[PDB]
Amino acid sequence: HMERASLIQKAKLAEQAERYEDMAAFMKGAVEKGEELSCEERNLLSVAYKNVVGGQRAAWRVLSSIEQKSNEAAGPEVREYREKVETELQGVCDTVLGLLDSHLIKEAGDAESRVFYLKMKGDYYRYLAEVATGDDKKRIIDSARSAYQEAMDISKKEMPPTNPIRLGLALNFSVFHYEIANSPEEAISLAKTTFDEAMADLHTLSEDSYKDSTLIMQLLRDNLTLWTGSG
């Protein structure tokens, strides 16, 4: 019921049953035991919270679109309910960021595990930045940049340009530049460089590796086509 192994077992069961809030709660409890997560366990944590925030972000976008479109019948209920969803989304990001700072991001371990947690830190600050409006916006945007930049430094020093964790990090940081930082030039540049450097190495790859890498590369290519407008 409580032992770490039972929590990992229940999170796998919650995944199969498509019960992602439960999965997240089981993985949070497993993290809070104080031990290292394996590659498998790291992914269960990611999948768990990605699905939870995915639904909240999608909902917030629908509500905010109704709120901003209604210009010149508006509704106090739209704002109130957009605020309810937003506060809830923020609570999940704050929980994830808390776990990362208190238990997951460590002095050193394997580069791959170190990049993963800083990419995560980046992403969850980026999710906060999507809804941030106050004087908070700048510090949140800065926090996402530091986390992403720190992970970039590790990936560029320890990983080859075809590594999927490195490719994924660069894709998300380029989305950050475009969407959040309002730097379309940096975004296009990072995505172009990342794709071109990985394309120059793709030959020295194993079937398993290749599939993960080419998947991210098409996400990069697609972003580029949309951002540059080339076709």
Binding site: K50, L171, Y178, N223
Partner: peptide, 9 residues
């Protein structure tokens, strides 16, 4: 070409 951008997944 108008679609939505893509992050990880």
């Amino acid at each position: 070409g108008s679609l939505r951008r893509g992050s990880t997944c």
